[PDB]
Amino acid sequence: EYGAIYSVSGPVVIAENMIGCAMYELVKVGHDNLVGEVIRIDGDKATIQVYEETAGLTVGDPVLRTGKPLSVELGPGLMETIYDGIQRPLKAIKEESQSIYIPRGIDTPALDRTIKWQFTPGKFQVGDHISGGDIYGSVFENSLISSHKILLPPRSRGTITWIAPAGEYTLDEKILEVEFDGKKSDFTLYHTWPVRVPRPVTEKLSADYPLLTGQRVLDALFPCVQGGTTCIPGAFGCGKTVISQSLSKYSNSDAIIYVGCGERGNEMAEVLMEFPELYTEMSGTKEPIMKRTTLVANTSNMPVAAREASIYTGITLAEYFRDQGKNVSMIADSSSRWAEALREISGRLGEMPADQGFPAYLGAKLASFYERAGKAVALGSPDRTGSVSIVAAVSPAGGDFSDPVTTATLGITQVFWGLDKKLAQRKHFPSINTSVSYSKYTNVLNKFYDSNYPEFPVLRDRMKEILSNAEELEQVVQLVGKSALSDSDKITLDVATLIKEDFLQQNGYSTYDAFCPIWKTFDMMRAFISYHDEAQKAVANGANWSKLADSTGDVKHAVSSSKFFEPSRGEKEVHGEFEKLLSTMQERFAESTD
Amino acid sequence: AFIILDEVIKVTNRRVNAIEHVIIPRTENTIAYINSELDELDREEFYRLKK
Amino acid sequence: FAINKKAVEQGFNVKPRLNYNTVSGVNGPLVILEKVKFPRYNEIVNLTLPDGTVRQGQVLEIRGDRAIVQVFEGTSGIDVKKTTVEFTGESLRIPVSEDMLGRIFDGSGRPIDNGPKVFAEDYLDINGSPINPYARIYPEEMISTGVSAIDTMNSIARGQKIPIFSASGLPHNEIAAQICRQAGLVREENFSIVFAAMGVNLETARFFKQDFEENGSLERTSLFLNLANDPTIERIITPRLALTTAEYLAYQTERHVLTILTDMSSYADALREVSAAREEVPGRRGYPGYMYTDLSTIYERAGRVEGRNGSITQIPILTMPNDDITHPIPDLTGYITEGQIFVDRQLHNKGIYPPINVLPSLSRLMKSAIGEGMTRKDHGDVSNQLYAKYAIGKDAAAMKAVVGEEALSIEDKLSLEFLEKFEKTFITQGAYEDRTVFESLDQAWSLLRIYPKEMLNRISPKILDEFYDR
């Protein structure tokens, strides 16, 4: 029934008279009912990790039980709002308290219980047979998402006995009754689910559709498939925020769940007041982005424990949205903070450490977490399809790539986007180390490419070899000089610099340089390769490249400035412009070289 | 003889300058890094034995 | 009135406190009690050594009916038969009031200026509480520090948290003094200062005091001094008191505070010191694992809020041990703070003051800071071009020193000349030489004209057409 506190140590609390307690069962402690999570059980006593500040607690305080694990409430209204690490709305807290801090022990419902939804029944009628995962009506949620499907929670099945009619309801109404052996079933517009148990699914699949990001280098050399995973190391100066924001903004996902585990916090306000005026035209037009997102914010200042449950909540919400058949795409902010929290809890608990003080099960935990991602087919009768594509962002301590967390992640993920520091210092803002960074979905994407752009794969390797040769010649020229350099080597170096300055630079502030469609990059890199090939052909035919380059002149400037073309002009007008530029460049090389 | 001596001395002098200004710093920084890592390992080993 | 009064009517609530005499253990900086009645985690106790002196401390652990008290001012001389521990029954708190301005306090916050005890307006827990992000607004206004190296390529916004990396034996103190002396806005003078120094030599303290005296600003600031001779454990308290006072002033009086911590390295050292006293798991270089969270707690009191017109700004000073960025202290500090200003040795060795380099410096809030209503559109592009040309000049100088002058293309020599002129004139400025953004940028334009117009890449054609000609 009740238990008394027996010992306290910062975030860990040990109670007694706790006999019926299970493991990982949720519990409320203190006179303010702080939330906890039992971890280890030893006779009467059971260790508890606390999810809030523990100051002023006194021995003898009553301890309660709930008998159910941690869970998050799904259903309509989840979206367009901001939640803390343990599923508490934040605007409601501030409004109700009229304060600026977070009052410890404050409780509010996960979803608004006052508003009403214009519900519509599905396609099932009394006397039919249903199983977990079948839709029984849609709900209007937003202009951007007209249909917010409601579902029968898994592990619940039977035959419907009574259903509600069309109309306006609050999510407390019991709109469906399921007749199993008994009539003990009622279902409102929402339900719950334990976070640590991944949602079921009919079966997984192979992802073969690129996840467009709007970044030239990312889309060109290290494509990311819609359904895979990635990793983005850094050195606290690489400015990885830019790519995260850009992909959260201009990607082609139906929904996105930004989650902040140990962030600077101010970025949350930045995104909060920045998104509300940035429109997307995926459906209809002009719909502001903020009607397409859900934020799980947990600043580094707030308690350590919540950094654990934050990512679980985010991934569970992503899975829920996927189950509706919408290709959601979650993105983390800092995985290293989660590992730090786990290490701190382990160390305080007083247990033997592992590599660099971390526990031993962190690798297994990371693998299990990452495994949840992947395209799949929903569980139900309508046979809808969805997908999830998480994008983590590790942050090492010394800025290198040898700490245990990064090594563990690289063994799990399948796309690696390393970020250099010096390139960022040079303001080459999309500073990606093109030497170590690698992708793995290259071969599979050929099925899409041949249908859409047959020549792209050969050209990417063309540029890759060009860059590799330039990097191989740089050290020799540095240690010796241009004295022992042939014309072809100088051509290679010049084109490598041209690429590094034009095809690899970007800035998400210029209107034209904020989002590069696939076709634009395709044509631009096509033009680059053609220019280099014509130069090589001419020099092979015979001419002093020092003389040839000055005559070539304006065409180099034209190819450099090609990126200035306004994206989304016609999608074919730009194609004609690229065709004309290529033709005139070829004519120039035909004559200027002569 | 003048031409040959000139080119030889130029080559050798530039090579010496390159060695002095590149190699030694590059290797000694790595030396320091390796020393730091090998000092780091023993710390956690000692912590574990103490535990 | 009545609203305020109701918040204070509970003062007349006298409550007797019981003092035990069962000290039954001691080792290191920790003291162990026994048979204590209903402990209370993280509260305050007042010891009384047998000679009558009294030291303070707070409980850190609560086993079954026994609290592990932690003492601030060492533990030597503690008796087991005569000492008497006493419990306040509440967490650590301090008085506050607008009258604290112009006063000097020791590490524990008691007055040391021969004045009377603060006539408190109310008490506040030192630790404070977090701020929900939904009630936070990032700033969009630029402060004008007068220092060209800052006010040109690394701007400061009212609400930012910009640390100043540094190395022992450099004039970071003078840079901080100049910044505080020239803390004006681009455009009253409400910039109260809560300077809080811990673990510093006497000369630094006296120099800071005299600098505040000369500018007629002492009557607008408060001082939290904690020299080296003071106990180490007490060190970790001062920044929390300073931040508590700053936030009180900036969120309950609508002031515009400007806090400048110093020597966070000493604070981290004290953390290591009384962290290895216990046997908690070590992080890197023997540092505690949770230093990241602790530093986040210290730093994450910044920015503006929804209702209050007040603001706040942090300029902590770091001391890299051996001039390495990869040291954990600067690593975490950069991970938390929003950009930082850096200092080099060779520039100082070259007699250049302020010896500030810009290649490793960074400031995130520049994007929101710069613009049209506050500066000319060119601002950002000028800075970007300066970065690019400076880096190219640096690499060209290195390569030239390697091989010689024969392979240096004309552009390479131009870059060398640009780098020389930049580092010799653009950065150098006097100890009392102000530079508003307009004149600084106008001077900056002079250096780029050496370059032929066409090569300038990172700058849009409009800026070149409308400004380069003049």
mmCIF file of C-alpha atoms in Angstrom, chain A residues 6-11 53-60 82 90-91 93-94 99-102 234-237 239-241 262-270 272-274 297 299-304 307 337 340 343-344 346-348 351 353 356-357 395-399 421 425-429 478 480-482 501 505-507 509, chain C residues 38-42 60-65 127 129-140 159 161 165 247 251-252 278 280-284 289-290 292-293 296-297 300 305-306 308 325-326 330-340 358-362 364-365 367-368 384 387-388 391 395 399 402-403 406-407 457-458 461:
data_model
loop_
_atom_site.group_PDB
_atom_site.id
_atom_site.type_symbol
_atom_site.label_atom_id
_atom_site.label_comp_id
_atom_site.label_asym_id
_atom_site.label_seq_id
_atom_site.Cartn_x
_atom_site.Cartn_y
_atom_site.Cartn_z
ATOM 1 C CA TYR A 6 15.013 4.777 3.923
ATOM 2 C CA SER A 7 18.003 6.467 2.265
ATOM 3 C CA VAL A 8 18.644 9.259 -0.229
ATOM 4 C CA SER A 9 21.628 10.105 -2.429
ATOM 5 C CA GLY A 10 20.956 12.865 -4.935
ATOM 6 C CA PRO A 11 18.869 11.266 -7.699
ATOM 7 C CA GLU A 53 14.998 17.431 -8.211
ATOM 8 C CA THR A 54 15.461 15.845 -4.772
ATOM 9 C CA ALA A 55 16.060 18.654 -2.274
ATOM 10 C CA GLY A 56 14.667 18.745 1.248
ATOM 11 C CA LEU A 57 13.400 15.159 1.218
ATOM 12 C CA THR A 58 13.198 13.655 4.708
ATOM 13 C CA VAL A 59 13.373 10.064 5.911
ATOM 14 C CA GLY A 60 9.915 8.703 6.684
ATOM 15 C CA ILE A 82 5.768 20.867 -26.979
ATOM 16 C CA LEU A 90 4.769 23.035 -21.270
ATOM 17 C CA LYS A 91 2.525 25.919 -22.347
ATOM 18 C CA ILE A 93 2.158 24.514 -17.100
ATOM 19 C CA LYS A 94 3.341 28.087 -17.623
ATOM 20 C CA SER A 99 5.490 31.527 -13.363
ATOM 21 C CA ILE A 100 8.808 31.202 -15.189
ATOM 22 C CA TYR A 101 10.152 28.065 -13.464
ATOM 23 C CA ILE A 102 8.901 24.477 -13.425
ATOM 24 C CA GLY A 234 31.311 16.960 -34.175
ATOM 25 C CA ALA A 235 33.687 19.092 -32.134
ATOM 26 C CA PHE A 236 31.287 21.644 -30.582
ATOM 27 C CA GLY A 237 32.260 24.126 -33.312
ATOM 28 C CA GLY A 239 27.928 24.006 -36.536
ATOM 29 C CA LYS A 240 25.999 20.772 -37.022
ATOM 30 C CA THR A 241 22.865 22.705 -36.048
ATOM 31 C CA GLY A 262 20.845 17.964 -23.197
ATOM 32 C CA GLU A 263 20.799 20.986 -25.506
ATOM 33 C CA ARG A 264 21.748 24.627 -25.053
ATOM 34 C CA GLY A 265 18.000 25.222 -24.666
ATOM 35 C CA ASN A 266 17.920 28.625 -26.333
ATOM 36 C CA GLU A 267 17.705 26.756 -29.642
ATOM 37 C CA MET A 268 14.286 25.550 -28.492
ATOM 38 C CA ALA A 269 13.056 29.147 -28.360
ATOM 39 C CA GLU A 270 14.788 29.804 -31.682
ATOM 40 C CA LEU A 272 9.707 27.879 -31.473
ATOM 41 C CA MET A 273 9.435 31.427 -32.806
ATOM 42 C CA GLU A 274 11.200 30.748 -36.123
ATOM 43 C CA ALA A 297 12.495 19.557 -25.270
ATOM 44 C CA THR A 299 17.487 21.331 -21.728
ATOM 45 C CA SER A 300 20.735 20.189 -20.141
ATOM 46 C CA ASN A 301 19.795 22.230 -17.059
ATOM 47 C CA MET A 302 16.749 20.109 -16.211
ATOM 48 C CA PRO A 303 17.182 16.925 -14.157
ATOM 49 C CA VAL A 304 19.564 14.256 -15.403
ATOM 50 C CA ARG A 307 17.313 12.790 -20.437
ATOM 51 C CA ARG A 337 24.316 13.297 -23.187
ATOM 52 C CA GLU A 340 26.674 10.594 -19.765
ATOM 53 C CA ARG A 343 27.195 6.598 -16.713
ATOM 54 C CA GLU A 344 26.371 8.984 -13.872
ATOM 55 C CA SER A 346 25.563 3.668 -12.885
ATOM 56 C CA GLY A 347 28.433 5.232 -10.960
ATOM 57 C CA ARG A 348 26.185 6.606 -8.234
ATOM 58 C CA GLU A 351 28.546 -0.822 -9.670
ATOM 59 C CA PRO A 353 32.310 0.232 -14.539
ATOM 60 C CA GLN A 356 36.064 4.670 -19.777
ATOM 61 C CA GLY A 357 33.798 4.416 -16.745
ATOM 62 C CA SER A 395 29.268 14.688 -29.685
ATOM 63 C CA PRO A 396 32.653 13.342 -28.523
ATOM 64 C CA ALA A 397 34.570 14.890 -25.618
ATOM 65 C CA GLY A 398 38.002 15.540 -27.124
ATOM 66 C CA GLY A 399 36.653 16.073 -30.635
ATOM 67 C CA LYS A 421 36.682 21.630 -37.358
ATOM 68 C CA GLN A 425 36.726 27.648 -39.045
ATOM 69 C CA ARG A 426 37.214 28.610 -42.700
ATOM 70 C CA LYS A 427 33.442 29.316 -42.863
ATOM 71 C CA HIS A 428 33.057 26.541 -45.462
ATOM 72 C CA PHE A 429 29.854 26.036 -43.586
ATOM 73 C CA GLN A 478 53.378 21.266 -50.614
ATOM 74 C CA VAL A 480 58.151 20.164 -53.343
ATOM 75 C CA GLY A 481 56.122 22.815 -55.170
ATOM 76 C CA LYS A 482 54.623 23.269 -58.610
ATOM 77 C CA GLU A 501 34.451 26.477 -53.577
ATOM 78 C CA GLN A 505 29.692 25.560 -50.296
ATOM 79 C CA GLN A 506 26.189 26.508 -49.197
ATOM 80 C CA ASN A 507 24.390 29.032 -46.994
ATOM 81 C CA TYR A 509 20.215 32.434 -45.844
ATOM 82 C CA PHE C 38 14.194 12.793 10.749
ATOM 83 C CA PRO C 39 17.062 14.120 8.599
ATOM 84 C CA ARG C 40 16.430 16.440 5.669
ATOM 85 C CA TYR C 41 18.457 16.118 2.484
ATOM 86 C CA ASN C 42 20.676 19.066 1.548
ATOM 87 C CA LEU C 60 25.074 15.169 1.403
ATOM 88 C CA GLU C 61 23.782 11.681 2.255
ATOM 89 C CA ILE C 62 21.066 10.265 4.485
ATOM 90 C CA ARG C 63 21.350 6.655 5.582
ATOM 91 C CA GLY C 64 19.000 5.196 8.154
ATOM 92 C CA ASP C 65 19.136 7.741 10.981
ATOM 93 C CA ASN C 127 20.529 26.844 -6.167
ATOM 94 C CA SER C 129 15.319 26.443 -10.369
ATOM 95 C CA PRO C 130 15.401 25.916 -14.143
ATOM 96 C CA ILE C 131 13.496 28.085 -16.608
ATOM 97 C CA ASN C 132 10.950 26.390 -18.836
ATOM 98 C CA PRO C 133 12.015 27.012 -22.463
ATOM 99 C CA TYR C 134 8.525 28.130 -23.491
ATOM 100 C CA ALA C 135 9.029 31.283 -21.380
ATOM 101 C CA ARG C 136 12.345 32.188 -23.046
ATOM 102 C CA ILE C 137 13.143 34.673 -25.817
ATOM 103 C CA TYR C 138 16.475 34.798 -27.580
ATOM 104 C CA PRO C 139 17.892 38.313 -28.040
ATOM 105 C CA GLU C 140 18.056 40.339 -31.251
ATOM 106 C CA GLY C 159 21.396 37.847 -23.490
ATOM 107 C CA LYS C 161 26.797 33.801 -22.819
ATOM 108 C CA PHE C 165 39.249 31.504 -23.240
ATOM 109 C CA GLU C 247 18.711 36.877 -11.625
ATOM 110 C CA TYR C 251 13.785 39.469 -13.075
ATOM 111 C CA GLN C 252 12.296 41.362 -10.119
ATOM 112 C CA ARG C 278 34.843 10.780 -2.008
ATOM 113 C CA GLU C 280 32.828 8.726 -7.145
ATOM 114 C CA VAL C 281 33.649 7.443 -10.624
ATOM 115 C CA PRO C 282 36.214 9.682 -12.365
ATOM 116 C CA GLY C 283 35.643 11.088 -15.816
ATOM 117 C CA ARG C 284 38.537 12.278 -17.972
ATOM 118 C CA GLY C 289 31.549 12.632 -14.547
ATOM 119 C CA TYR C 290 28.779 15.092 -13.676
ATOM 120 C CA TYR C 292 29.081 18.700 -17.459
ATOM 121 C CA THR C 293 25.720 18.862 -15.695
ATOM 122 C CA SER C 296 25.340 23.517 -17.371
ATOM 123 C CA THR C 297 23.534 24.442 -14.159
ATOM 124 C CA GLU C 300 22.175 28.068 -17.916
ATOM 125 C CA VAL C 305 12.178 36.051 -20.422
ATOM 126 C CA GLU C 306 8.564 36.644 -21.419
ATOM 127 C CA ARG C 308 10.350 41.007 -17.579
ATOM 128 C CA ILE C 325 41.586 23.389 -26.470
ATOM 129 C CA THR C 326 40.998 19.633 -26.198
ATOM 130 C CA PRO C 330 37.166 24.230 -22.530
ATOM 131 C CA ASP C 331 35.554 21.269 -24.299
ATOM 132 C CA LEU C 332 32.469 21.295 -22.086
ATOM 133 C CA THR C 333 32.410 25.090 -21.866
ATOM 134 C CA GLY C 334 32.250 25.342 -25.647
ATOM 135 C CA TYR C 335 29.675 22.558 -25.743
ATOM 136 C CA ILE C 336 27.446 24.676 -23.490
ATOM 137 C CA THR C 337 28.108 28.337 -24.226
ATOM 138 C CA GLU C 338 27.193 30.156 -27.446
ATOM 139 C CA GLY C 339 30.504 30.896 -29.137
ATOM 140 C CA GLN C 340 33.581 32.359 -27.459
ATOM 141 C CA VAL C 358 39.706 35.456 -34.700
ATOM 142 C CA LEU C 359 40.303 32.214 -36.593
ATOM 143 C CA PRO C 360 39.121 29.993 -33.687
ATOM 144 C CA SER C 361 36.616 32.529 -32.331
ATOM 145 C CA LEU C 362 32.909 32.051 -32.971
ATOM 146 C CA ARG C 364 26.218 32.036 -32.990
ATOM 147 C CA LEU C 365 23.947 35.017 -32.301
ATOM 148 C CA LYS C 367 22.966 36.048 -37.550
ATOM 149 C CA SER C 368 20.159 37.577 -35.488
ATOM 150 C CA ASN C 384 33.221 36.412 -44.098
ATOM 151 C CA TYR C 387 37.924 35.306 -42.416
ATOM 152 C CA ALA C 388 38.686 33.795 -45.816
ATOM 153 C CA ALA C 391 43.091 32.090 -43.397
ATOM 154 C CA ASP C 395 48.519 29.310 -44.907
ATOM 155 C CA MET C 399 54.099 27.658 -47.038
ATOM 156 C CA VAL C 402 58.608 26.314 -45.688
ATOM 157 C CA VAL C 403 59.844 26.649 -49.268
ATOM 158 C CA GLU C 406 59.762 31.668 -55.574
ATOM 159 C CA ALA C 407 56.471 29.730 -55.642
ATOM 160 C CA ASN C 457 33.906 35.766 -53.939
ATOM 161 C CA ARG C 458 31.992 35.479 -50.646
ATOM 162 C CA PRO C 461 27.910 41.913 -56.290
#
